[PDB]
Assembly symmetry: none
Homo-oligomer: 399 residues x 3
């Protein structure tokens, strides 16, 4: 209608979505996840779908196989690396609280850290895996604070900071450990009072209280029931346990920060999705990873595979950090020895999905299934409409 | 009341805190920021500056608690016996860059550019190998690798300019040294307006000047305004800034003391601006991108942590230091505009000397326009004297040693009564 | 049409003079007209070659047609500053200031403060020399005192220095016999005419001429907030301003804008619209005819010729060879009241400014030419004559006398309507 093409593209997408609380949600969730459960031999799965700001939960399988215990909406799964999204957000909170700057060097908060190669390494580098070759894991022998200080003072980098991005638990682990030092609280207390309790995530635990071990599900690796074994900085990197309800609340909160009474935590949620680095079509936030939406499905699917996600890539400093783009695919994979988790959402379209499973199955399957689900819920061939914006030529070129 | 400050000086009084408070209580004790005290300190500082530096004419604006106070001396045109007035136009010189920076900032807030974009993105014909890793941020912050202080006077065409930049040999890698230069930020300003389709003068007019009602600020003085365009004076001769390549972006703005007071006010409190991308633009222009000594580089503006070491800004304004190369550490990501800052910029032409400096949290500011190019340390020293006196304190030795007395009351030792007896 | 005019003249209903004037406007509008376009055309076509020929940096011209002003600007008030001449630019009027001085004197007469027939020594008793016995204010105002010098000497720098200057002066002629243009004469007249008021000349001029006429940008001393409009004068390429001198305010020291000067010319054309009664009578007295020299009449500052004029006479007579020479005067006793059918004008100059003012009151026509270079008088008077004549119809004294003969016979008999029509066409 002689229209401004800008609104024409997106609004056309929304009408195409109006074509099809759609119980279709139940349909596509079943048609996508059931072949995934059967195909991957997944003992139990909890899946939450956020549609129009409202959660719809779906539970399959056993939380405890030998005990015939079913996965309920109160089952606790090991979030694994998804924990980082919390850490990041907590870090963001500190930034909003005026306690830290990402541009600050790490040693400003660990004074006892004095090795020469730690002079140009900043909290941003630790939070974004861009410190220059921190190992993917803290060594098992690290069991004390002086053991940890000994590990980092004797770490020798591969690269100069800000040049390379290597996914590592020690990087954002130390980031989380440092971001709370100006608070006075420990990491557990800080996360509990500044993130969990303000969002009323009342069954999300860094340490499962024994009165709650009944809901702690078993993870299954090679048929044996496993739980994540303790480690150093585990709370910052991979040691959060939550229920599908609390995780659905987590996605709701990371899509609509303007609904949170906490102002500092709101700005922190916004800062965790800021675009600090670029690699390919992926932007690195604080814990979260972002892409532009619409997105290339084979790119996020093949990019989720550990063959790529663990490989070091060079980064482009985005100055200033691009504020939280709503036309984004915000996601994070998680996994422990026995669990497999995935969180992905598109904030502009108010859409989200959480997928918790007590078996660690490959990330490409999770990103693939989530892409099929959220995809059918509403392409680059479509964006040819922006170039196509006469009336009969459009209606006929579509029909 | 002062006894309550002393008794508070416990963890109920910080490093600064009581220094600041005793400063404003000393302000209350002397005058108290009277519209008379302003005139008094401004005269006792600027008058000897004028007589010593042999400054033909001068205008000074003092922003105190967000209110402008204008002051005029001397002659805009010596021969014509024309006095400096509040409608007199001065050549801002390098202070023009504060506009360019802000304009650049606005472009960022519009999503038309990113400081991390490469220079070659907006000028593809810039094909030399040395331009490969150079970004708009490098150009805006004098960190491209050693661009020259001036664009040569003989650069007078587009091809002359292209050849100028192609033939430039960097002395350093991008992002490692700060060397102040008109070619750097000038090129930045010229590039930042290309996605808007406007000329630099038109973008500046419609995006900065007009939203701020800067109705007597010009890149090109229109003919009916030439009567207010003051003469610059270099060695007794009347002079005006000649046209040059990229002058509009680097040193070609002309303004009045009123418009300059409104500029400083707008950069102190962008929250009163209807234009949103201009407000964010100011915010980005006062962001801290690099650090050198105790100095942070914004977009045109330069910022120090407040309170500031007077000897550092005064000595650092001299051209032996201000124009030298210095190493930079990147502030990545850039810190947003810190209100506890001393934000300033010097400017000059052949025959004009100007300075602008403000402290945003204290709502304090000063503009100094003069039609002679006199040394920077004199300008920054006078400005520090005025702003220091007006904010409460006096003498750097008195500030350090009074901070010492308060630290003594903190570490027991001095204890309320003896501190007070020493102070009164 | 002309037919209506000739028939009306046959019917006694019109004077041959009114026939002459109306016919003048008719053939004026036959091809050109009194449209604001004819003004623009003749002004451009006259002043542009004047500026290009005389190498004039900047200029302002006001043309008053039927009491309305039309302004024109060229060039630069400040060359170096690239500052254009505008309607707020201040020029140095030079000797045109005398027209103000005269009018002020007239106002003084209308106030009953002075008499032109009083001796000068009455208002300056300390002037005790013998040669001052028969010299009156009229003599000083009209350059007929007996040979006062063109200039007051530069070494005259105090009131007593001035007294010594006038006491030791040697007259070459008896009062009332020769006209010698001189700043000392009318300058002394202006200084004396304000003495009974107790005001200074600057104060009397400000409150009694400038302020009643709303001449709000006319100055004897340019105040500091106005120096930005005070144009530079240019003499041999250098910028110059008129230096202070004895009696400068009375003789050549006024600065004005093209607007204020347009109001000055209108005020002298139609004083009948001025609330200030004594200023109105003062203007009228300043255009009275006190002496005759050739075809020229001397007023108070203003000089008058009968309109229409022989152009070569005003052009040639404006040159300094004649204008500064001594010429004998015939006394017009008593002075003729201000003749509206006159060419009333005055030239003025300083080192770096050249100005000219000329108006015809009966035709409500006028021109002001202010320029920041001192170029010869005949060029100014020629330009003004071309413009005003063109705007008035075509003129010429011989022509008007011929048409007046045909119209006189029209009122008598001899010709009759269709005759005069045929002879005119």
């Amino acid at each position: 209608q002689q229209m401004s093409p800008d609104a024409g593209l997106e609004l056309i997408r929304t009408y195409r979505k109006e074509q099809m609380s759609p119980q279709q949600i139940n349909d596509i969730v079943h048609r996508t996840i059931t072949p995934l459960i059967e195909q991957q031999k997944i003992p139990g799965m909890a899946v939450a779908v956020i549609y129009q700001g409202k959660p719809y939960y779906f539970t399959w399988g056993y939380a405890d196989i030998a005990k015939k215990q079913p996965v309920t909406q109160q089952t606790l799964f090991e979030l694994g690396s998804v924990s980082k999204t919390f850490t990041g957000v907590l870090g963001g909170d500190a930034i909003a609280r005026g306690e830290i700057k990402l541009s600050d060097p790490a040693t400003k908060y660990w004074p006892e850290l004095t090795a020469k190669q730690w002079n140009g390494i900043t909290l941003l580098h630790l939070a974004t895996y861009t410190a220059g070759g921190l190992p993917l894991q803290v060594p098992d022998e690290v069991k004390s604070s002086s053991d940890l200080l000994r590990f980092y003072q004797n770490w020798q980098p591969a690269w100069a900071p800000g040049t390379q991005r290597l996914y590592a638990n020690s990087s954002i682990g130390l980031f989380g450990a440092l971001a709370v030092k100006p608070s006075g609280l420990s990491f557990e207390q800080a996360m509990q009072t500044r993130v969990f309790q303000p969002l009323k995530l009342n069954h999300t635990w860094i340490n499962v209280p024994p009165p709650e071990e009944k809901n702690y599900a078993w993870g299954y690796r090679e048929g044996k029931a496993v739980h994540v074994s303790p480690g150093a900085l585990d709370a910052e990197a991979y040691g959060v346990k939550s229920t599908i309800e609390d995780m659905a609340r987590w996605v709701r909160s990371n899509m609509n920060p303007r609904d949170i009474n906490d102002k500092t935590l709101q700005q922190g949620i916004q800062l965790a999705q800021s675009r600090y680095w670029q690699t390919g079509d992926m932007y690195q936030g604080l814990g979260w990873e972002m892409l532009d939406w619409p997105v290339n499905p084979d790119s996020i699917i093949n990019g989720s595979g550990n063959k790529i996600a663990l490989a070091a890539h060079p980064v482009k400093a985005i100055t200033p950090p691009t504020p939280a783009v709503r036309a984004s695919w915000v996601h994070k994979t998680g996994a422990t020895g026995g669990f497999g988790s995935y969180v992905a959402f598109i904030p502009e379209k108010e859409l989200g999905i959480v997928m918790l499973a007590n078996k660690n199955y490959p990330n490409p399957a999770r990103v693939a299934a989530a892409w099929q689900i959220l995809n059918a819920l509403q392409k680059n061939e479509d964006q040819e409409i922006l170039f196509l914006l006469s009336a009969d030529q459009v209606y006929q070129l579509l029909e």
